């Protein structure tokens, strides 16, 4: 859930700052320590097939 | 003449003079793009019109619509140089107004609420450079043009093969530019056939079905009717004279009392023009003739109300007698015959298992979505959403066009959906040809070859990209709210930017751009290709499709094309080629009307050249341009003869046109054999750019062409004189005339300097200009790699001697003096970008600094205090370029090595060294060190040194254009303050700032002195926000991959001359690897004691037959000559006049050229500059197929004081002694392509290994061993080496125990093996065991 309230955040912010939201941006726009952004968004991140 | 030409001039030898010059050569790529993105106010392909085919987008039903308005690409985040350096990517912002409107439920229609979101962002969208390049991550990219079968309708044979009944078969296919294919073929019953792509067949009337058409109306539409009359009684029939054609009496024709056939009697030609001119429209005819014929139409009893015959059923006798009685007069009949018009469509409808249109839908239905149950609204959406629908289905312009066209239609432009008459049409197309009137089409034929590009294709990603965001539109607009959402909400970003990125990114058809030389840019930025998508593939189409077609000409190079797995599946586009405004191809020809050969230039494609008979580019006519022979050879449709005088409609317009710039720039040409001229103009492309970029002694012509129109050189935008000349920029003063009004100004042209290649070459630009020069407008202002005053050169011309030399040229070698590598001529120099990755691992973050365990003083001495190497530092391999390291913590030691450590007191680092050390073997000078580090963690010292320097320099840069930008500017207003208001001395006097407040008396000139006002603020101003920016985009951390902190590139220029193992070779496709490196001692010289550079194998030029590349020693030698006797009489000093009338005489050479000459040039400072350029050798061009010959070339060597058979006596360097017989000198241009012998040369003892399956692998850039394939194995099993196999199937490979083991014995001094089991074999068994089968090792 902490990993899909970190994708809404993006949706908006992508748009409406042009280019990106930085990658701390969506940290204080979220409730935790928000230096975990960098620890969230790598675990979230399904392993490439090794057989690509 | 331009000014460079004043320089340098180029002796040109042939007669056809040039009516229409080379264009640009980039033009294909350009336009393309430049059709892609752009503002075009209509349906014309662009972003507007991808745009406009999917938009409106509206809800399902729910009148909630979201419909486009105008877009808009904002300026690009980083520019050319600086996206480049960084390596994001070269792109635009995507900005699009999108007009969401709800309509209020229960219409009239009209709007509750209607938001116009802002231009909201979807994507960014790469750019096309100046150059036709592109950059996806700070690399220079190439989207190759695609040749693919165009749109629209296709008829084939497929005679032969099928069946081998040799009946043939005939199939057409309609290929749609997006949506489902649509086929038609014959079977051996005559029964036609349908099928939607490639799936199962289906009886032809069952689509017609689908379209609503009853039995009756499909035969009304594909047969002609007979009418048989019931009149009085026995029968009667309409009869139209023509029909008896190609059929034989089957009983007594006779009508009007007059007997016009008798039983057994063909009708022939006779019969019928009695039949005419009598006028018989009515016959009688007996009652077992209708035995065989099929009744048109339904027929019912009127009384009954019963169905007596069915439509297309036979008659009988006796259905005749039941259908009579019941009243009916007329019955209508098919026409048939076996041969004139055939009887298909009824057997068709006899294998059609269907009846109404339901019946048909449901098949077809049941067809493409087969084993689910069908129903009447899916039937009829899948129907009608495949041929029918304006959003799944279009041939676009060129699909209708060539649709319409191939139907024998008028209209050349339609909709882009299937119609009712279309599909008709169509088969009624393949009916006639199967009925013997109409041709089938060939592919092969460039007419149904169309040509696609960047832009294209781009646009037809940037629409999927926009399919798949209407989908998530809409399933959006489902359950949404009133007013709270916007075009924002919905629209992503991410959906679209892949969608392009995926493209520019990978595809088969974009790639690097090659740029180790000039050739090869512009030769990959002309490029065709059969293979991608939409495309066939190497292992699906045969020979055919590969090989030459006479369609070819003019269009596509025959010579140029890879020689591989893919030969004559890419070729290349030819010299003056175009693209057809269709998309097809057409070349450039000369119209002769009446007997006059006309100027005027005419583009014909491949359909339309067709008919017409052209003449020869190779044709003698004078004078007013008539023909000189009574006939003349020529080509008209696919063929080739002798043609009369005067029928010919049309003339080629160069020798040249037939083939491409490649092969443009083989001199001599016309002396080699296709295959050797091949791989040439593909070596061509290969070769490394020199030290010093020398000039081709030998040329074409196009060589100047190739240089200016790719973006390697700088060319002046303006003309004017020359106020400063540096080796990193050049500033020009323009000329009024040229000049605009507003803001006065200089052209500054910043060079590029020694930068990395995407070859990882040299690219550097040379000034070739001094200071103050007057430069002509479009002339070159300095020369970039491999070129020379305009010119293009790819290599350096050289002395060669054909003769064996001690069996050191063997086969294709290459013995070379000392002269050369000494000469430092062939040295190339090489920029490899090497990276350094500072990344985070759970023991800990990885540092940059200077402290590393286990290294000398002399190892952290070439590191700063920040652990980066210095700017200039020479290195070589194993030097420590970046100082890095990583945490690894408890190292778990040993009992020996604890007590090791007891002895010795080391303290074992919790730190490895992961530091990024010069590659092994190769050395170079650092030309630049990059640091690109995380936004927000604190920039290192080395880093922060660099951004200050950075800072400064661009400070410096930004305040130098000011300053010759505002010089400039003011220098004009003293100039225009100086009419009306003049005072010489006054005017500089007080200060410049203070010049705005003069005025001047009433005139234009006063607000020209506004408008340098306005501008010159203008500049002011704009100087500030470019500082700001530039600081900003300096100090800004780049955004960096996940895990990694920073990241450190060093640039290394190492410089490699040549040895032994490199690769050089002619134009003429002769290759050749040098062999040893003979010194100057040893040369074969001449009499005049001058040695030979390179000896040559004769041997080589007979077998090979290139005997081009002798010529091109001959002249070669002969310019040589011309060059040395100017070299003489520089030396000698004479004058003016006895340089120039030398020079002169040289340009003229015999009778009949169209060089033409100077004295118009200045006598004095010009000529003796010529002179001074020409002393290196005299530079010739030899057109193509126009170029010199046998006489000229020795008339020149007349001229030059060489014999005539080019071969003068040699004697051994060693001996001393002459050569038995003459021999061969001459000056042969050679290159040397990049198979340079350091790159290649590889070896491996033991190094890493593969995780999966245990084999050598090389992850440190340490090359894994070589392979050893089954050939090899069997080559050792031929011998009788058992050890020598299983040792290097076994131990030195694949088992994990015996390699190790193996290792131990070999340093111990014992060689043997305990082989054990390979890991591969070992793997296997668990895999089949891990299956249900158990496989098992038997007894012992
Ligand atoms: O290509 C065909 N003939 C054909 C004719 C010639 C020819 N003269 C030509 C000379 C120059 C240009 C075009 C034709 N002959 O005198 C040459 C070729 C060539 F491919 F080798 F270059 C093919 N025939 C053909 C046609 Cl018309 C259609 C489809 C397939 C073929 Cl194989």
């Known amino acids: ?52 | 003449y331009s000014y460079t030409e004043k320089k340098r001039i180029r002796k040109d030898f042939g007669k056809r003079p040039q009516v229409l010059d080379v264009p640009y050569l980039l033009s294909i790529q350009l336009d393309s793009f430049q059709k892609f993105i752009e503002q075009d106010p209509e349906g014309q392909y662009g972003l507007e019109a991808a745009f406009r085919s999917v938009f409106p987008i509206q809800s399902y039903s729910g009148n909630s619509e979201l419909q486009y308005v105008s877009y808009r690409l904002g300026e690009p985040v980083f520019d050319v140089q600086e996206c480049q350096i960084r390596g994001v990517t070269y792109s635009a912002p995507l900005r699009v107004k999108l007009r969401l409107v709800i309509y209020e439920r229960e219409a009239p229609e009209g709007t509750v609420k209607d938001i116009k979101e802002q231009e909201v962002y979807m994507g960014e969208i790469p750019l096309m450079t100046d150059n036709g390049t592109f950059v996806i991550n700070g690399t220079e990219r190439v989207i190759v043009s695609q040749l693919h079968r165009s749109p629209g309708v296709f008829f084939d044979s497929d005679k032969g093969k099928t069946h081998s009944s040799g009946k043939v078969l005939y199939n057409a296919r309609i290929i749609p530019y997006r949506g489902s294919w649509l086929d038609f073929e014959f079977d051996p019953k005559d029964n036609l056939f349908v099928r939607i792509d490639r799936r199962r067949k289906l009886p032809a009337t069952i689509i017609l079905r689908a379209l609503n058409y009853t039995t009756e109306q499909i035969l009304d539409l594909f047969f002609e009717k007979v009418i048989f009359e019931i009149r009085d009684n026995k029968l009667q029939m309409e009869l139209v004279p023509e029909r008896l054609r190609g059929e034989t009496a089957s009983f007594d024709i006779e009508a009007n009392g007059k007997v016009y056939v008798e039983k057994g009697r063909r009708i022939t030609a006779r019969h019928i023009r009695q039949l005419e001119k009598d006028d018989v429209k009515l016959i009688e005819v007996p009652v077992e003739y209708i035995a065989g014929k099929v009744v048109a139409k339904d027929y019912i009893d009127e009384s009954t109300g019963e169905l007596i015959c069915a439509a297309n059923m036979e008659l009988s006798l006796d259905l005749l007698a039941k259908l009579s009685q019941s009243g009916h007069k007329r019955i209508e009949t098919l026409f048939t015959n076996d041969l004139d018009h055939g009887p298909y469509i009824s057997e068709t409808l006899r294998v059609d298992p269907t009846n109404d249109r339901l019946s048909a839908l449901v098949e077809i239905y049941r067809m493409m979505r087969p084993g689910e149950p069908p129903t009447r609204e899916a039937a009829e959406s899948l129907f009608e959403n495949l041929f029918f629908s304006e959003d799944r289905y279009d041939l676009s312009a060129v699909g209708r066009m060539k649709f319409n066209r191939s139907l024998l239609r008028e209209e050349i432009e339609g909709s882009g959906i299937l119609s009712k008459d279309d599909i008709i049409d169509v088969m009624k197309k393949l009916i006639d040809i199967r009925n013997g009137k109409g041709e089938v089409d060939d592919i092969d034929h460039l007419g149904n070859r169309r040509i696609r590009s960047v832009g294209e294709m781009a646009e037809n990603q940037f629409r999927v990209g926009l399919v798949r965001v209407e989908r998530a539109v809409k399933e959006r607009l489902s359950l949404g709210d009133l007013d709270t959402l916007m075009p924002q909400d919905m629209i992503n970003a991410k959906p679209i930017s892949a969608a392009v990125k995926e493209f520019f990114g990978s595809s088969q058809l974009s790639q690097f751009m090659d740029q180790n030389n000039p050739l090869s840019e512009i030769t990959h930025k002309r490029r065709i290709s059969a293979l991608g998508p939409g495309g066939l593939t190497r292992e699906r189409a045969g020979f055919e499709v590969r090989d030459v077609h006479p369609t070819h000409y003019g269009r596509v190079c025959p010579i140029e094309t890879p020689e591989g797995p893919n030969i004559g599946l890419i070729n290349s586009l030819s010299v003056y080629a175009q693209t057809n405004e269709y998309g097809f191809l057409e070349t450039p020809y000369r119209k002769v009307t009446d007997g006059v050969v006309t100027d005027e230039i005419h583009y014909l494609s491949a359909i339309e050249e067709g008919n017409y008979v052209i003449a020869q580019a190779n044709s003698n006519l004078d004078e007013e341009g008539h023909f000189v022979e009574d006939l003349v050879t020529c080509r008209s449709k696919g063929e080739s003869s002798l043609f009369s005088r005067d029928q010919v409609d049309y003339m080629d317009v160069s020798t040249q046109q037939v083939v491409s710039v490649g092969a443009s720039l083989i001199p001599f040409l016309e002396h080699d054999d296709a295959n050797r001229a091949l791989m040439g103009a593909n070596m061509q492309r290969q070769a490394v750019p020199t030290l010093r970029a020398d000039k081709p002694l030998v040329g074409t012509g196009m060589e100047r062409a190739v240089a200016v129109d790719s973006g390697v050189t700088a060319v002046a935008k303006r003309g004017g004189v020359v106020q400063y000349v540096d080796a990193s920029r050049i500033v020009i003063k323009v000329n009024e005339d040229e000049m605009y009004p507003g803001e006065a100004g200089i052209d500054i042209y910043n060079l590029t300097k020694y930068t990395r290649s995407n070859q990882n070459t040299c690219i550097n630009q040379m000034p070739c200009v001094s200071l103050g020069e007057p430069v002509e407008r479009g002339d070159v202002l300095a020369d970039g790699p491999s070129t020379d005053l305009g010119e293009l050169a790819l290599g350096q011309n050289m002395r060669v001697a054909f003769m064996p030399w001690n069996g050191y040229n063997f086969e294709d070698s290459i013995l070379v003096s000392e002269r050369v590598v000494q000469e430092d001529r062939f040295t190339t120099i090489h920029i490899q970008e090497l990276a350094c990755v500072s990344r985070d691992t759970k023991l800990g973050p990885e540092e940059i600094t200077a402290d590393i365990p286990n290294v000398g003083e002399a190892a952290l001495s070439k590191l700063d205090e920040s652990g980066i190497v210095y700017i200039g530092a020479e290195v070589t391999g194993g030097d420590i370029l970046v100082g890095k390291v990583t945490p690894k913590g408890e190292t778990q030691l040993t009992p020996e090595e604890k007590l090791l450590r007891a002895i010795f007191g080391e303290k074992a680092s919790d730190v490895k060294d992961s530091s990024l050390r010069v590659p092994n073997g190769v050395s170079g000078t650092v030309i630049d060190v990059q640091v690109f580090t995380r936004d927000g963690v604190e920039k290192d010292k080395r880093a922060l040194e660099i951004e200050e320097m950075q800072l400064k320099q661009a400070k410096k840069d930004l305040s130098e254009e000011l300053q010759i930008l505002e010089a400039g500017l003011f220098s004009r207003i003293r100039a225009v303050l100086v009419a009306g208001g003049v005072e010489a001395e006054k005017l500089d006097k007080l200060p410049r700032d203070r010049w705005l407040e003069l005025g001047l008396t009433d005139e234009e000139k006063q607000n020209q002195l506004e408008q340098l006002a306005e501008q010159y603020d203008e500049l002011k101003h704009e100087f500030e926000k470019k500082l700001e920016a530039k600081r900003r985009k300096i100090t800004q951390g780049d955004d960096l991959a996940p895990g990694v902190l920073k990241i450190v590139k060093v640039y290394l220029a190492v410089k490699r001359r040549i040895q032994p193992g490199d690769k050089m070779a002619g134009r003429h496709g002769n290759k050749g690897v040098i062999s040893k490196i003979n010194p100057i001692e040893d040369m074969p010289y001449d009499e005049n004691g001058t040695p030979v550079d390179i000896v040559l194998n004769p041997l080589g030029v007979p077998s090979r037959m290139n005997i081009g590349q002798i010529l091109e020693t001959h002249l070669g030698m002969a310019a040589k000559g011309i060059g040395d006797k100017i070299n003489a009489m520089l030396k000698q000093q004479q004058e003016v006049a006895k340089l120039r009338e030398f020079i002169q005489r040289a340009y003229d050479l015999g009778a009949d050229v169209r060089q033409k000459v100077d004295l118009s040039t200045f006598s004095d400072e010009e000529v003796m500059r010529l002179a001074e350029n020409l002393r290196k050798g005299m530079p010739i061009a030899t057109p193509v197929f126009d170029g010199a010959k046998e006489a000229e070339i020795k008339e020149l060597l007349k001229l030059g004081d060489l014999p005539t058979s080019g071969q003068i006596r040699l004697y051994d360097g060693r001996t001393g002694e002459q050569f038995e017989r003459p021999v061969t000198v001459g000056y042969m241009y050679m290159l040397k392509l990049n198979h340079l012998v350091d790159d290649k040369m590889h070896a491996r003892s033991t190094g890493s290994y593969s995780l999966v399956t245990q084999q050598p692998l090389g992850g440190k850039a340490q090359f894994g061993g070589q392979r050893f394939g089954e050939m090899e194995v069997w080559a050792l099993e031929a011998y009788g080496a058992a050890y020598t196999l299983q040792e290097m199937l076994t131990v030195k490979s694949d088992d994990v125990n015996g390699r190790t083991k193996m290792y131990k014995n070999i340093v111990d001094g014992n060689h043997q093996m305990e082989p054990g089991m390979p890991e591969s074999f070992n793997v296997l068994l668990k895999e089949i065991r891990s299956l249900g089968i158990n496989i098992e090792l038997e007894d012992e």
């Open chain 1, 1 to 52: 859930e902490t990993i899909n309230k970190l994708n809404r955040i993006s949706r908006q912010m992508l748009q409406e700052m042009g280019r990106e939201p930085t990658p701390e941006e969506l940290a204080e726009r979220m409730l935790m320590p928000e230096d975990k952004i960098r620890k969230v968004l790598k675990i979230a991140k399904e392993p490439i097939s090794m057989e690509t």
